[PDB]
C-alpha cells in the first residue's frame with residue numbers, strides 16, 4: 453500500500469542496478485513503479501521473473517519521438533556517440549510527461565538517478581519525497597569534490613594519481629556539487645557500493661556533502677541460455693581458468709587503433725578469449741586483417757551482445773579484460789575474476805585505480821600520449837592467466853568474492869530505516 457516510483461537514467465548499467473534495488477524493495481512490502489523508456493524497459497524485463505508481476509509495474513516515459521529518432525534509439529545501449537546530445541535533450545524535454553505520470557500515480561516516494569536534475573524538482577513541485585540513488589562508485593565522486601574544499605592538500609586516503617590523458621555537461625555538474633538541501637528527501641543518498649572497497653571514501657564523502665551516505669550494494673544479478681548454449685559448449689572444452697572475457701561496455705565503441713592493440717595483445721598472450729565486439733545501432737575489418745588465425749579455436753568474437761554474467765561465472769574463465777565500468781567491476785569482484793583494466797573514458801580510469809588498490813586486478817598503463825600498448829596487455833594476461841605467476845592477484849580476487857557472497861539480507865537494513873523515517877516526516881510535511 454506504500455508505492456515507490458523508480459526513475460533510472462537511460463542506459464543499461466543504470467537500469468539493471470535500479471531493478472535489483474526494485475526487487476529488494478518489492479520483497480519488503482513496497483509497491484514499485486518502474487519508469488523508463490520502452491526500449492530500456494523491454495531490454496530489462498527478462499531479468500525480472502514472473503513472480504514480480506503483482507508487485508513491480510512497468511511505467512513508460514515518453515521522450516520526443518521523430519521518424520529518424522524513434523523510441524528504439526531512446527537509450528544509450530548501442531547509441532551512436534553523435535546522437536547522445538539529442539538523447540540528453542529528449543530526456544530533459546520529457547519532464548512535463550513525468551509530471552503527468554507522477555501526479556497520476558501519486559507515489560509516496562521517488563527514487564531517482566544522478567543524471568536528471570529535473571526529476572527531484574518535479575517531485576518537489578508536487579509535494580513528493582525524492583531520494584538520490586547513485587549506481588556508480590564513490591571513489592570518483594569524492595576525488596571530484598576534494599579540490600573544491602582542499603585545493604591545497606592531496607587526496608587523503610588514496611595513493612592513486614590520475615594520468616595526463618584524462619586530466620585534459622561538466623558545467624551543469626559543477627552546479628550539482630553546490631546543490632542546496634533544505635528537506636529530508638536530500639538528507640540521504642543511496643549508493644551502489646560497499647564499505648570493504650570504499651568505506652574510507654564513503655566516510656569522506658559524507659563529510660564533503662554533509663549528507664548521509666547509505667550503501668546498498670553491490671547489486672549484481674546472478675544468472676534464457678539464448679547465446680550461452682554455443683558459448684558454454686565451446687567453454688567446456690577449455691582448461692580451468694584458461695580463458696579471458698573481453699568487454700568494453702554498451703556506451704563506448706573502441707577505436708580502430710585501440711582494438712588493433714588489444715587484439716594483438718591477446719594474440720601475443722596465447723590465452724583463450726571470448727571478445728564482445730559491437731557496432732553502433734545506426735549501421736572482421738575492425739579486428740586486424742588475419743587476426744583470427746592463431747586465435748582460431750582459441751578465441752571467439754561475439755557480435756552484438758553476450759551473456760557476460762554467465763561467462764564470468766564459468767570455471768574456465770580466469771580473467772576479464774574490461775573497460776572498468778562500475779557494473780562490470782562489481783560483477784568481476786562478486787564472481788572472483790581478476791580484472792585486467794583497460795579504462796577508456798569517464799569514471800573508468802578511477803575505477804581501474806580502485807581495482808589496483810584493492811588487489812583484485814591490474815591496470816594496463818597507457819603510454820604518455822594515452823595510447824593502448826600491445827605489450828602491456830599481453831604481459832598482464834600472461835602473468836594473470838596464461839602463466840599464473842601473479843598469484844597474489846588471484847587470491848585477493850576469490851577472497852573478495854568470498855566476502856561479497858557472504859553478505860546477507862542486512863545489506864538493505866540501513867536503507868529501509870532511512871526511507872521509513874523520511875516517509876513519516878512527510879505525513880506532517
Ligand SMILES: O=c1ccn([C@@H]2O[C@H](COP(=O)(O)OP(=O)(O)O[C@H]3O[C@H](CO)[C@@H](O)[C@H](O)[C@H]3O)[C@@H](O)[C@H]2O)c(=O)[nH]1
Nearest residue numbers: 463464465466468701702703728757758760777778779780
Ligand atoms: O555483452 C554484455 C555487455 C554488458 N552486459 C551487462 O551490462 C552492464 C554493463 O555494465 P557497465 O559496462 O558498467 O555499464 P554501461 O552502461 O555499458 O557503461 C556505463 O557504466 C557506468 C555505470 O552504469 C556509467 O556511469 C558510464 O557512463 C559507463 O561506463 C552490466 O550489467 C553487464 O553485465 C552484459 O550482460 N553483456
